[PDB]
Design a protein around this ligand. Structure first.
Ligand SMILES: *C(=O)[C@@H]([C@@H]1NC(C(=O)O)=C(S[C@@H]2CN[C@@H](C(=O)N(C)C)C2)[C@@H]1C)[C@@H](C)O
Length: 262
């Protein structure tokens, strides 16, 4: 059905930006692709691979998720909805992971990066699960420049869709860790206006949004349409002006377009 292709193409043209979509239907492994092999800056969506790297460690290191880290007034970044509540005290890695994933807390992200030894370690983890496109280069907030043509902190919609699938439904993570990642993605509190907005209200969704410079507005999610096989969806969107406004409505439209009737 190229109807979807035409609709996506029109959506992009009308938006005046560059749209990236990758949908994987686990029912038969069919895919809906639109610039699925092009690179897009990930913004907060890179936080999923990051949190997953920590979960991977917990498979061998027992109780690591309960390990504590101190939050100093110096760790605070441009967005600390949760961490700012702990300046002077501690947060476990689980709490930190939850904070970065569900509230997109930047301080929490850098705390996880520090724990992992830097962005290069997240990239290594991605490679270990077969993702040869993903690449994390900087920490928060520099990783959000999203400069057109810059390959730093980018990935493709398809590569991210495959990795999200491997992580949440596949074998990239062990049972317990897989369940925690899914639980965290379902508990996201910032996706209300994105992919979720374009889906029937009773469908169950796990997702991670993101928004940064050049009006880059992203979202990656796993969708369970009632009792049907899960859908893995990545909607990436970026614009020409560095100061462009975010277009969460564009991702919602894209989501409706590709998931309608699934
Ligand atoms: C990540 O991409 C940045 C971070 N992540 C997200 C996100 O939704 O994933 C938010 S955007 C959110 C809606 N717009 C802002 C505002 O409306 N609030 C005050 C409610 C927050 C945030 C931009 C991170 C890299 O900085």
């Amino acid at each position: 059905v190229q109807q979807v292709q035409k609709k996506l193409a029109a959506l992009e043209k009308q938006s005046g930006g560059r749209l990236g979509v990758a949908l994987i239907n686990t029912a038969d492994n069919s895919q809906v692709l639109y610039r699925a092999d092009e690179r897009f800056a990930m913004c907060s969506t890179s936080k999923v691979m990051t949190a997953a790297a920590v979960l991977k460690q917990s498979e061998t290191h027992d109780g690591i998720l309960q390990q504590k880290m101190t939050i100093k007034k110096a760790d605070l970044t441009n967005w600390n909805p949760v961490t700012e509540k702990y300046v002077g005290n501690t947060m476990t890695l689980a709490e930190l992971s939850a904070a970065t994933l569900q509230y997109s807390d930047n301080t929490a992200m850098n705390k996880l990066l520090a724990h992992l030894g830097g962005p290069g370690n997240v990239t290594a983890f991605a490679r270990s699960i077969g993702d040869t496109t993903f690449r994390l280069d900087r920490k928060e907030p520099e990783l959000n420049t999203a400069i057109p043509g810059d390959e730093r902190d980018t990935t493709s919609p398809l590569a991210m869709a495959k990795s999200l699938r491997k992580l949440t439904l596949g074998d990239a993570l062990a049972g317990p860790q897989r369940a925690q990642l899914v639980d965290w993605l379902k508990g996201n509190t910032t996706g209300g206006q994105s992919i979720r907005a374009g889906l029937p209200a009773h469908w169950v969704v796990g997702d991670k949004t993101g928004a940064c410079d050049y009006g880059t507005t992203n979202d990656i999610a796993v969708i369970w349409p009632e009792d049907r096989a899960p859908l893995v969806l990545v909607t990436y969107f970026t614009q020409p002006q560095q100061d462009a406004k975010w277009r969460k409505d564009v991702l919602a439209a894209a989501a409706k377009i590709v998931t309608e009737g699934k």
